[PDB]
Amino acid sequence: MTERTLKVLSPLHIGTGNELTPVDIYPRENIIHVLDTERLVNDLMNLGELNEILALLKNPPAYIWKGYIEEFHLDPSDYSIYTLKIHGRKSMQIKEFIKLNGRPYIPGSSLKGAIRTAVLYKALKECDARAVMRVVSKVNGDVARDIGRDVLDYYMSFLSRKRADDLLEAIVFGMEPDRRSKIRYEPKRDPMKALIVRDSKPVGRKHLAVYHVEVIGNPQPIPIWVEAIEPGAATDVEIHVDTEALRLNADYFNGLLWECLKERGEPGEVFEDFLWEAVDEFYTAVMKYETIEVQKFSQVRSFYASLEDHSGHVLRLGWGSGWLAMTIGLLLVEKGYKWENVRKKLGLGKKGSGFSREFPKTRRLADGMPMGWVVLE
């Protein structure tokens, strides 16, 4: 297949590491507006200075620093998003979406990193009796992975910026020759270098709006303002596997993922079929796991029961996907105390350690919708 289009079922924020200060914004109505400082500042000179360089650096009481253009001028906006929520007293930092010409698209590095989490989950399920024969070749540390006994039961005690997944990515994707440690990752040995995803077509201005993300898990909830693609927008993305790049590397790949493909048939032929069966088994499993916790908001469960009977492949993206959806640690729930000492080793809570709500405490949902759901087919 080529040009496998998608749709959007919840708010979806792909960050760019940038926020809109209140000098960029003046909401005249329930609609909001993104003013053009470079053009507006250079357009407010004809009527005259050094006052703009003094007032913007001062940041006084925002509202008046954007409504002072209303005196003898008006109508200087760029994008003019919608607020779509009962907020905005400016006092906000709207996190902006990634845009190529002021037009929102989905980056392909972000949809590949979600498939890579789904594919990593499938490799650690099926592959401890076969995980030693992978590291039997030029690693010599599989005896430690055999005496502990499913390499996960060793890695909880093996650990006991952050390079925590360094060995686990080197077992499922790329066995190296040697290192100062036991093994390391080699980018030249990877089936995922044959997985080609591309940036999608740009979404559109009509489907972009500001949101009001409330954080739930504490008695005092906090709001975060953010912009995200509204649910119901459908764009098209093309994903294909280059099978010719796997035929050349039939002897050079050394990993547990390659030892999941030689059992479904020809390993350069079933990798694209293994790929989506890994998607609908990581993300349906994190979909069912969130029906256990009812701390959110009621209506959240009526979204999750409606995610079933929906054709296509369902997966998370973006910013509101929690620790449960960007991490192997869905599989590390069934350990309990084997992961309880290690979750405090890294540490989590700050400003000692969170005892009973260590990992799953935060839920970031926009307008009562669990954000970040995109369904391919």
Partner 1 sequence: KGKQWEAIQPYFDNVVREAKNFLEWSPNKRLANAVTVAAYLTSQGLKTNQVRKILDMARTTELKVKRGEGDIKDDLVKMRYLLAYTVGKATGQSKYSLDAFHRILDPMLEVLMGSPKKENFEKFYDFLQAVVAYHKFFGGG
Partner 2 sequence: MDRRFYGKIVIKGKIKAVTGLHIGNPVIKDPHTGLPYIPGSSLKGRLRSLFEILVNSRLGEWREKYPSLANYSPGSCRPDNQENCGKFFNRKINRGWIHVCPDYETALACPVCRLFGASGKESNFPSRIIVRDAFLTKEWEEKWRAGEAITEAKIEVGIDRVTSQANPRTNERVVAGAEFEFEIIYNVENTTHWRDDIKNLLTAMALLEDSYLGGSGSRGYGKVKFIFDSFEFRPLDYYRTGKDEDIVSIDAREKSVSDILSGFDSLFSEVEGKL
Partner RNA sequence: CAAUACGCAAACCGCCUCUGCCCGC
Residue 215 Cβ vs RNA, minimum distance, rounded to whole Å: 7
Asked if 69 interacts with partner 1 (CB under 8 A), we say no
- The site partner of 222 among RNA, partner 1, partner 2, none (C-beta below 5 to 8 Å per kind) is RNA
Which of 53, 248, 294, 333 binds partner 2 (CB under 8 A)? It is 248
57 binds partner 1 (CB under 8 A): yes
Q: Among all chains, which residue has been given the structure tokens 């400016």?
A: 90
C-alpha torsion 52→57→58→62, nearest 10:
80
| b/e code 175-202 from CB counts within 10 Å (16+ = b) | bbeeeeebbbbbeebbbbbbbebebbee
368, 299 in Cβ contact below 8 A? yes
Task: Give dist(CA 221, CA 180) in Å, integer.
Answer: 46
Residue (208 or 325) nearer to partner 2, CB: 325
Q: Whose Cβ is closer to partner 2: residue 26's or residue 185's?
A: 185
CA dihedral 360, 362, 368, 372 (to 10 degrees): -70
Taking phi over 0 as left and psi of -120 to 50 as alpha, with beta for the rest, 80 belongs to: left
Instruction: Pull the structure tokens for residue 125.
Output: 């399920």
Helix (H) or strand (E) holding 142: helix 142-148
Minimum Å distance from CB 198 to RNA? 19
What does 89 bind: partner 1, partner 2, RNA, none (CB cut-off 5 to 8 Å by kind)?
A: RNA
Q: Smaller CB distance to partner 2: residue 62 or 331?
A: 331
Point out which span in 5-13, 70-78, 80-88, 99-107 binds partner 2 (CB under 8 A).
Answer: 99-107
3-class state of residue 346 by DSSP: helix
* Closest CB 54 distance from partner 2, rounded Å: 27
Stretch that binds partner 1, among 51-59, 71-79, 98-106, 261-269 (CB under 8 A): 51-59
Please choose, out of 136-144, 292-300, 326-334, 366-374, the segment that lies near partner 2 by the rule CB under 8 A: 326-334
**What three-state secondary structure class fits 187?**
coil
Contact with partner 2 (CB under 8 A): which of 132, 215, 216, 245?
245
Interaction of residue 294 with partner 1, rule CB under 8 A: no
Cα gap 13→16, rounded to integer Å: 9
| Distance in Å, CB of 30 to RNA, minimum | 16
By rule CB under 8 A, what string of x and - marks binding of each residue 195-234 to partner 2? xxxxx-----------------------------------
Question: Is residue 181 involved in binding partner 2 (CB under 8 A)?
Answer: no
Q: Which tokens hold the place of 29?
A: 């109505």
The 10 Å Cβ neighbour count of residue 254 is: 21
Choose, by CB under 8 A, the member of 38, 75, 244, 309 that binds partner 1.
38
Give the one residue of 4, 7, 36, 52 binding partner 1; rule: CB under 8 A.
52
Question: Over the range 108-118, which residues count as b (16 or more CB within 10 Å of their CB) and which as e?
Answer: beebbebbebb
For position 245 contacting partner 1 by CB under 8 A, the verdict is no
- Rule CB under 8 A: say whether 54 interacts with partner 1: yes
Distance of CA 10 to the CA centre of its chain: 14
Stretch that binds partner 1, among 38-46, 130-138, 139-147, 311-319 (CB under 8 A): 38-46
Residues that bind partner 1 (CB under 8 A): 21, 23, 37-38, 41-42, 52-54, 56-59
